[PDB]
Amino acid sequence: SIPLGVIHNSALQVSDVDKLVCRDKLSSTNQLRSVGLNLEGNGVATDVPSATKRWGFRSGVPPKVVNYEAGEWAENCYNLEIKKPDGSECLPAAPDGIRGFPRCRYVHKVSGTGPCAGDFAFHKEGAFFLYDRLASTVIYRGTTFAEGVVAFLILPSGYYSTTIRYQATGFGTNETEYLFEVDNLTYVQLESRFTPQFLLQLNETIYTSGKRSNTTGKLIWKVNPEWAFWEXXXXXXX
Amino acid sequence: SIPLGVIHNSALQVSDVDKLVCRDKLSSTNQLRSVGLNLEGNGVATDVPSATKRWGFRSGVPPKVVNYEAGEWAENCYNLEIKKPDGSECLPAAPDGIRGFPRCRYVHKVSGTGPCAGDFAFHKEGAFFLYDRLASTVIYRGTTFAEGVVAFLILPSGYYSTTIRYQATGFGTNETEYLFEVDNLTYVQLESRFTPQFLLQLNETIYTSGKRSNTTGKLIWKVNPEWAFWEXXXXXXX
Amino acid sequence: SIPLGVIHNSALQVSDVDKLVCRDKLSSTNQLRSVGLNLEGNGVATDVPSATKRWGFRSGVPPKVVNYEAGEWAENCYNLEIKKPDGSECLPAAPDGIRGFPRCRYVHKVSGTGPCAGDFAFHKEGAFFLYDRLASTVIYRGTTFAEGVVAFLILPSGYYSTTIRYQATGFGTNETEYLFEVDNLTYVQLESRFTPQFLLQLNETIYTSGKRSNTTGKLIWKVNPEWAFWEXXXXXXX
Amino acid sequence: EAIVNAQPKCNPNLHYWTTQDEGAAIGLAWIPYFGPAAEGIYIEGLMHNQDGLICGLRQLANETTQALQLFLRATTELRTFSILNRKAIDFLLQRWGGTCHILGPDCCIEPADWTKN
Amino acid sequence: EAIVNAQPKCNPNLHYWTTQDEGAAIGLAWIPYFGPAAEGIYIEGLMHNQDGLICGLRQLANETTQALQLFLRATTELRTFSILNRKAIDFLLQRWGGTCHILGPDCCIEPADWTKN
Amino acid sequence: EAIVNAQPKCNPNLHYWTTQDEGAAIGLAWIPYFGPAAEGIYIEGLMHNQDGLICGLRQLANETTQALQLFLRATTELRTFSILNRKAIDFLLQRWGGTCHILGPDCCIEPADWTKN
Numbered sequence A, B, C: 001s002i003p004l005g006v007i008h009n010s011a012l013q014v015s016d017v018d019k020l021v022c023r024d025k026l027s028s029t030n031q032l033r034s035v036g037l038n039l040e041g042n043g044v045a046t047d048v049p050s051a052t053k054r055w056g057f058r059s060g061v062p063p064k065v066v067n068y069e070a071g072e073w074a075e076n077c078y079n080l081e082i083k084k085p086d087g088s089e090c091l092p093a094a095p096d097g098i099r100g101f102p103r104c105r106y107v108h109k110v111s112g113t114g115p116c117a118g119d120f121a122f123h124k125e126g127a128f129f130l131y132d133r134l135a136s137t138v139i140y141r142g143t144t145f146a147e148g149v150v151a152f153l154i155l156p157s158g159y160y161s162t163t164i165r166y167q168a169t170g171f172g173t174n175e176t177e178y179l180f181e182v183d184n185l186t187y188v189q190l191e192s193r194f195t196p197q198f199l200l201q202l203n204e205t206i207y208t209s210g211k212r213s214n215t216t217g218k219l220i221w222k223v224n225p226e227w228a229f230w231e232x233x234x235x236x237x238x
Numbered sequence D, E, F: 001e002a003i004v005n006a007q008p009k010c011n012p013n014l015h016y017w018t019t020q021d022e023g024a025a026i027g028l029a030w031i032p033y034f035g036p037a038a039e040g041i042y043i044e045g046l047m048h049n050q051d052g053l054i055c056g057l058r059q060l061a062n063e064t065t066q067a068l069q070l071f072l073r074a075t076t077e078l079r080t081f082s083i084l085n086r087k088a089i090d091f092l093l094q095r096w097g098g099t100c101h102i103l104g105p106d107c108c109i110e111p112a113d114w115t116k117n
Ligand SMILES: *[C@@H]1O[C@H](CO)[C@@H](O[C@@H]2O[C@H](CO)[C@@H](O[C@@H]3O[C@H](CO[C@H]4O[C@H](CO)[C@@H](O)[C@H](O)[C@@H]4O)[C@@H](O)[C@H](O[C@H]4O[C@H](CO)[C@@H](O)[C@H](O)[C@@H]4O)[C@@H]3O)[C@H](O)[C@H]2NC(C)=O)[C@H](O)[C@H]1NC(C)=O
Pocket: A042, A053, A124, A125, A126, A127, A128, A149, F006, F007, F008, F062, F063, F065
């Protein structure tokens, strides 16, 4: 049976089936709750290059959706607009009723291209893509999601969100290139080491140091080197 | 909890939750019934101008649908074909499986234009638009509905329908004009006071008095003045 | 109530409702099973001409779908691509999530034309078209199905599939003509008497006897005359 | 609570439509291919205001709306068919969701004829 | 009632397909990205006519059709997945839907070893 | 079994979002036409690791995934909303799915105050 969590002896635990516990009380369906937890909270790498490597395309497996009633405020969410080199869409449009994950501090909107050798994009570790009270096994186009897993159990500052935009080539491969976007003509080579706050700070200095492209071509910066979150012209910058 | 009706002491009443009544018997799911009642039966104004003022457009609220198993024969139903002035549709097509309300004595089919400042049309008093055993919070294009509300409870002449067609400008506003249609070129200025039977009688006299437009332009009549139901040429007529 | 099967006294039987049997035990929802059985197993004629006569077009009846959890390996399945003479499709595309029946020894793919005097194709005997764990009252275009019925009850060599292609004119009528296809230009007049294995054997001899059309026109063979399964040039062949 | 009809008017009679509970069809009317169209699957009945049930029904559906709307806001299901089954489950959980203490007020076991034993 | 197979023939053997009940997958076969395609999620079994269950099963599915079709006509759900859960609820309501009168015929409480006390 | 958090890290605090259970809206906020948009139907709360429930919750959702994925593979429902109702039904069937032998270990009837009678 799908595990069901219950609090015995001041500790959560999975209820053993073949053992019946008459002392446990279920007074109404309200006592049952479905719950989604973010992979964030387990310490996974949340930077775009590390996160995208956990997703992959596959055919022959029909997508599946399951609902959950409560979720967790996420530090990092993702929003993908991936096409093939010929411009055809890699991800399906969001089905009716599936909205973005409701609480994200940083939405990493990645746009770009990749081979997309599969009808759908799944989570390689079997996790779920968490949407608004709906968990899907696949990724929907242009829809904000957090990586997460679902639990079932028996009960006994405002919201600020900022979008960080990226450009990708070779998406979903071993040789993926990423560019942080500060405007439509000025980009920064992306490293796994760059945190969300570092990207927002670097963006502002580029705007205040006038280091934006003042031509009509794309300007690409590289940068010198310069614990979990809750605890064609190239150049350089040091 | 959503209220649930039960018959205690020869009187219906909402079952109190925290009070358990062991004498109440629920022998099967068949004893539970969902039920839809028409706002008609509460004495609301059913004429087109009064009824339409209870509906309004709004965005950001996803539509919701709930089913009901039994309904009430309606005196008045409505069927809307509203476009913006530029000809784009204001109401969504009926989703698959949603048919018109099954029992209507008069279907008021309103066609016309309005600003439609919202993705969907809701009931301003929070009632439901009753379709065929499906209750929706929004209005679907060209689909016949009655205004109504749903109840849940525990159990212990043919059908004639006639269509009355209207034309509307400024639909969903404070300054809406309505025209009763007797043919494609002959109309009557609509008043809240006009009952369905009065409209059908006035239509027949216009046909039998030859007062229809015998030109190629639109003929618009105004008319002189001349309890619930269960108990460009203008002119005049007195 | 929908009948529910139970094993009393070493024999299956429908559980009488008004008689309560306290000795019957239902320990979990896992004990309840929905099950689909093929009309094949009751001895019906499975040849294309006999099978198609059990299906017919009808309007005004909305399609309905019910799921089943376990099914039976079928000897015969069918896959229809029927258009009107003007080329419009007669059958609807398969709704999302409805795949072909999962186990078929012979898929009879019939392509052709008929009047199709109805919005959907139903089973004239009220049986179901069995798909992959979904039973529908109607036929979907290009989707493999077996004819079957569903049962509900309380519990107390590889897979080889070959496609046999046909051509049909006057589909869904009293005067339907069928042609077994051995290639795109060589056909055999179809008789009810022809079994699947006979069709595969006749196909191979035509290929090994060089009796295929070696022109650019269609070659049609007729053939001389020459228990259930589990127990424009014409010509002749004898 | 109690239901007090607070509506401007009340149609005391109820001409209703619904669908039949099984019922052996005359011959082959159960086959969808032969059966009635969507427009002809309904039965009809008329119920008067004995015990005031009709006017109470209208008030009950009116007062249900707020809870129903708040339920529909919180669900992500586009069409909800499960309210009545969930109320049936709640009915059973209220009475049988924990140990049944006989002679207790939240346990519906009557050993009356087991007491005369 | 009783089920009497009244069909022209009966395949007494039942080669069946279905899906497995959980079952720890060998390593990562449970991950949808790595797991089998839609065509390879099935198991197979063969069941013979011991106690005549196979031929009774075929007659039972045949006789179920009328009620099932009439149920599908009356519902507005495009796809029905709730028949078995609703039968489970009906099972519990038949036995526990009212007060349980011990020693009564509609109450499944046996105080046999509570009587020897 | 027992739940042992075997994850590389654990956020011991849980900032959560959900929807409210009914709650009388201030005036007309329950009407969909007047109510909040999809983005503003949520409440928020913060829960710390008392009794280690947060870190156990993260491990529980991690360990649920295999069974959940295998369930989703075997169902043909595109969106599953029935897991919790079915667990409620299973809860009742485990205790009340057969005759209740008093003083037995699989029957949750306590005649303690019926024994003092
Ligand atoms: C529930 O919680 C557990 C524990 O937190 C999660 O377990 C993770 O499971 C995934 C796979 O399901 C693991 O990912 C695998 O990691 C292996 C080792 O990781 C590194 O460490 C070794 C050193 O020991 C290095 O040599 C190695 O290179 C790695 O750097 C990899 O060997 C695996 O490789 C696979 O992926 C790569 C990249 O795609 C492919 O090239 C390979 O061919 C191969 O397919 C794989 O990456 C992960 O390490 C586990 N975490 C922990 C902490 O143990 C569960 O995933 C989680 N469940 C859910 C649903 O969230």
